[PDB]
Amino acid sequence: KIKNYKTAPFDSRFPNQNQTKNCWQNYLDFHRCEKAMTAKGGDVSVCEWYRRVYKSLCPVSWVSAWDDRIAEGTFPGKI
Amino acid sequence: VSAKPAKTPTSAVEQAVGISAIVVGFMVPAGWVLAHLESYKKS
Amino acid sequence: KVPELQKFFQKADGVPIHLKRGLPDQMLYRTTMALTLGGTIYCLIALYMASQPR
Amino acid sequence: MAYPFQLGLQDATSPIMEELMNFHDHTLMIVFLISSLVLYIISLMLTTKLTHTSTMDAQEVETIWTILPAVILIMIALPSLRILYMMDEINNPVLTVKTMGHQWYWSYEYTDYEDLCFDSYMIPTNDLKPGELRLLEVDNRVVLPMELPIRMLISSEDVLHSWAVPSLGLKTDAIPGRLNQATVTSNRPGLFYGQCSEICGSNHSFMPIVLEMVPLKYFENWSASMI
Amino acid sequence: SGGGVPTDEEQATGLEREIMIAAQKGLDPYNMLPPKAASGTKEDPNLVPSISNKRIVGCICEEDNCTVIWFWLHKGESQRCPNCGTHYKLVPHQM
Amino acid sequence: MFINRWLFSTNHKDIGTLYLLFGAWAGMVGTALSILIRAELGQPGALLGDDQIYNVIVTAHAFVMIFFMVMPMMIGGFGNWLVPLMIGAPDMAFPRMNNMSFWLLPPSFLLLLASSMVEAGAGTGWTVYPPLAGNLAHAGASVDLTIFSLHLAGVSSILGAINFITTIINMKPPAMTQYQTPLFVWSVLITAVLLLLSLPVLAAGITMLLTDRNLNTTFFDPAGGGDPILYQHLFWFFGHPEVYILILPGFGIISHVVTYYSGKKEPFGYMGMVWAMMSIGFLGFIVWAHHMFTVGLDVDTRAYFTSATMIIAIPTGVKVFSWLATLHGGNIKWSPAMLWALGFIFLFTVGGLTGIVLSNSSLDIVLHDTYYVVAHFHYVLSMGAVFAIMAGFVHWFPLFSGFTLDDTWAKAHFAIMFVGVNMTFFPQHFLGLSGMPRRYSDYPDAYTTWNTVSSMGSFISLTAVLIMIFMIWEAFASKREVMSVSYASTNLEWLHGCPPPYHTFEEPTYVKVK
Amino acid sequence: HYEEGPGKNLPFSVENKWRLLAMMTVYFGSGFAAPFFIVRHQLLKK
Amino acid sequence: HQTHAYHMVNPSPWPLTGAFSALLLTSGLVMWFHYNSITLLTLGLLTNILTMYQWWRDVIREGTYQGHHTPIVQKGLRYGMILFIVSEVFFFAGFFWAFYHSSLVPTHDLGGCWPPTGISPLNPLEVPLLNTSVLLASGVSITWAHHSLMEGKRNHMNQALLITIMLGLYFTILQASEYFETSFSISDGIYGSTFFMATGFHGLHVIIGSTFLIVCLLRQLKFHFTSKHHFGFEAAAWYWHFVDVVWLFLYVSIYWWGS
Amino acid sequence: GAGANTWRLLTFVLALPGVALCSLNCWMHAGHHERPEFIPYHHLRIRTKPFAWGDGNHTLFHNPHVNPLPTGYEH
């Protein structure tokens, strides 16, 4: 468990100025954990931390559009 | 570059007339269009 | 029959080569500059009408 | 912020604006040295009356005239790289702000927890309260805590903007389809004024930025009151 | 399949024919190659041909030198380079 | 008799004459736009209203002064008048493309003037960055007309560059090497090389921008997977070679002027001059992302780009110290073009060191899009390139026209121009340091005083070009011709007379190798 | 053949001083007065 | 008179007409995209084809009939067209740089992978491979035509250059048929944009090369080319090999890699 | 080198038979696939400015058999 999430940490994998790929990959990892815990049937909410990570990084408009195109089924990310 | 004497030498009065002509020919249209910007803004 | 035209294009005339053939290149030059002048003035009219809104 | 008859930079609040200001003083001393060299040499070497207009040794001073500007150029370059590498180190920040520049107004999201968002427009000139600053005052000032590393992600919805505050030493492009990092700290509380640097239409002069830096307890009270 | 295509010794006319016909015997009246017969003395000067009364003459008079120096050369006896004094004479009869 | 001499011209002197006339007209357009810009910034408030018309004026000032005043006059006019004269060629290699390049220029000017006239107006800066220059913020025909203006100017300069390179390499006398040519011929060669290696990059960039605007491609907007940093990459990959196109024939002109009026038979370190010009040309292609230090690049990328900017800084230092060294111990004749050349040396040195201040990426993060950059590029462009233009014009106006200017009016013109442009662009350093950014029609009150000072300096510079016209008229008000010219043995263009005849070098030069 | 000499290699006659003064001032004044009328047009439109 | 071997051109009007014709094209594109008028565009297209025909016929008249083409003149012409080829190389290199920056780092809106989702790229081992084979075979046939010109054979040259033109026309109509039966359009994102701009500019350049080849064919059949002074045909071979090299970089870059 | 008859036989051995069997290989692989199901992506079928030929929705090479539209297919 890595909760008491006060803000996002410094990710060593993408350490440069552009932080687009952090929120794209973190939202993708959150949905892929949703899929993996749906197929496994175990605890989904243990990767609830991933959710808060994208909630800190890419804006409300980007996230809202992505929920719209995952609700309709127009998501280019292979989840 | 050394030079001829002027074939048609210019008096000082004609140089003054020429520079006054250049100044008035440059500041009449630009001076007129900047005399009223507010009239172009639908007064 | 290139060398007879080679003889023909030796000037002895004081005329440029784009008016050297005689009739047909002269009239199609004539039409070329006429239609490009008409196109240029129609470009100026088109640009003035495009600058004016409605 | 700028005061009348100001010649140099604005005074520093972040650490990096202090190191960049010291480096600016260093490189401007170097500029003054080279400019005085060129000016004094040309004023010396025009005013002579002696002459020498014959064949001269072509290559006998070129190695010195190529090694000395290389020495001064690396003398500029090493502190430049030293402070260049001191903007993207490990930060471990405290807060994360998300700033989106819409068509001539800024917008601010504090959604680390308890999602909060608002819009910053300019207070108009005829609607100014007395004592205020023309072309710089905003509706909602952007409230940040004191002396802590604050992660800040800048973007725009439609066109190119530039979120810039000079006295904190921040200037970062706001590009659509992008997300740009800037860490922001402080040392003094108060109000810092910046404005957009990228050309963004017919009101490009008319988006200001006001950063109001306060202690952390007052930032917590402001976050509780604003939501 | 035999020949067919023309050879430029008979098809080509005009200025190309004139310089090819002149250059098959080692003559360059139309100045494609650098000239010859070089000696700086006043008894055997550098001879230049022309078709007019004067010609621009450019001198590299010491080797590995940047700037050519140019001067007019007229008829009569030989003039010379203004800094080195290699003798240049004009024989205006060529075509 | 007129349309065959001028409209259908096939010799280089006439093309250079019309280049000089067109550039003088376009420069007067540009200084009118500059008077407009300093007119709105003179006092606080909105003289013209919104920032859209001001941005249209700013973009027009940039494009007219870049592609229509320095490039045609400098490259086309001085190259066509002097390059076949210094190398001893009878004409250009392809004179018909030279004529077509000149006659392609005023269509591009008319398209730009129409671009300013359509109901939107191309108010985006001379950087035509999307998505501001898209069909959403600028829905109209102004950006397309500006794009086609740049297309026509690029085709013109590509044709001129091809003609210049083939006429320099091929039309030498067969005994001369390339290293025995004058320095302005070298500057024209290197400028034409960088022109035809650089211009297709912006041609492809504005082609892709036009297809984004009108063919629904998504090269640049991120809604379809595009990226505007790609446009900035392509534009500045053209744009810094374009910068060195602006500055390099000025280097050749000042080398010739200082060598002539200093009494020297050669510039000191001719091989150093040639090597430094080759180095500046070769290193202009690897330093473009110093225009992109705040866009969000890698830290290692910007470290490389500021380092490569220092290595492009060294060989122009070699050039300026060699100019000082060829000033050493000569018969200094204080001609007007001498004063223009020394003003070039000092003020271009100041502009170069302000560029060196901008070279560091950290102080570029502080000083991006401020008026410190504006002071830098005006101290190089509007002072170095303009002073080199005026030095060449004052020096070779006896060769072109056949008449000599009044030297006293010329020195007065230099003094007025010097004071005016120095008081114009020195407070902009303080305006950039204080933090008032670019492209603004209205500023806070704290930036008032310097702006006020800057505005009135422009008017002094305006008066300068006014009396410059008087200068030209006074020459034709005097009709004094030339005795002869000193140092005509070393300079080939002066040895056929002032002005030279229509047919020069019918009997070519006689230079031997053996 | 075209004219050779001083003042004849130019596309305009320099043989009259005052006519050339008027021609120069209308040429360069039209150049100076084009963008001001452009700005007048953009202000008159909106 | 004249003693230099450089050609002095008579005062010719095709510079002015070509320049104002380019003005007509630019104004015609602006009037077509926005105000929807096609007459000015077609007037400009007619003006370029007339001006170019007269310019190049004048060059033919002064070259093969008046004999103004001394060896320094075709040395200069070689320099000029080599420079033009290098300029077009850097134009296509700018387009290639656009494609490489597009496909090197895919974005979040595309989905983070190349090719994007919802597109079906062309499999490279079918008829694009036939286009590569056709262009290479036309290069080999034009090299046979060049050696038949240098060796002095006329009918072998006619057969070689005829099949060169035939494969050029076959290549451009095969490419046009692939523009017909492709499964994605120019509005299908950055992949479609880069693909169709790169292939369309290559198609325009190969139809320009085909036109230059057919006018070279009629010049050869009118006995213009001699044994060694045949610079227009060497120009055709150089531009044709340039188009072949550009298509080889296109097929390795876009068609095969990433698809 | 610099032969003439060897390049004619080089063409007639390598080039024209090569294009011949490549055309035969394209003939044996001349089989179309089914039309894929239409999913309305927003990074595809970009409509910012209408086209300037005919209607404005069709592209220049828009064949209705395989190419889609932003509002589905065509029937």
Ligand code: HEA
């Ligand atoms: C004449 C045109 C011209 C010339 C020559 C230059 C020359 C240079 N330019 Fe400039 N530049 C522009 C025109 C020009 N520029 C324009 C028009 C822009 C605006 C683009 C925009 O709108 O964004 C611009 C922008 C620009 C920026 C963008 C800043 C920003 O907005 O973020 C930068 C920063 O790197 C820069 C740098 C330089 C440098 C380092 C040089 C150097 O080449 C200068 C040469 C250096 C010298 C002459 C130094 C003198 C050296 C000596 C005397 C030897 C001794 C030296 C030492 C010992 C160190 N230029």
Ligand code: HEA
């Ligand atoms: C050639 C380039 C050039 C030249 C000369 C100038 C000259 C001047 N510029 Fe310009 N300027 C730019 C290129 C140039 N500028 C560019 C590229 C920008 C950036 C635009 C952007 O932000 O996108 C810019 C931006 C710019 C701004 C920014 C506006 C803003 O962003 O808010 C301002 C305002 O201060 C300004 C002012 C001036 C002034 C007062 C002059 C004065 O020097 C005017 C005096 C000039 C002349 C008088 C011309 C010289 C000609 C002659 C003397 C006659 C020649 C004829 C013969 C010899 C026959 N310039």
Ligand code: CUA
């Ligand atoms: Cu946002 Cu300027």
Ligand SMILES: [Cu+2]
């Ligand atoms: Cu640069």
Ligand code: NA
């Ligand atoms: Na204002």
Ligand SMILES: [Zn+2]
């Ligand atoms: Zn000598």
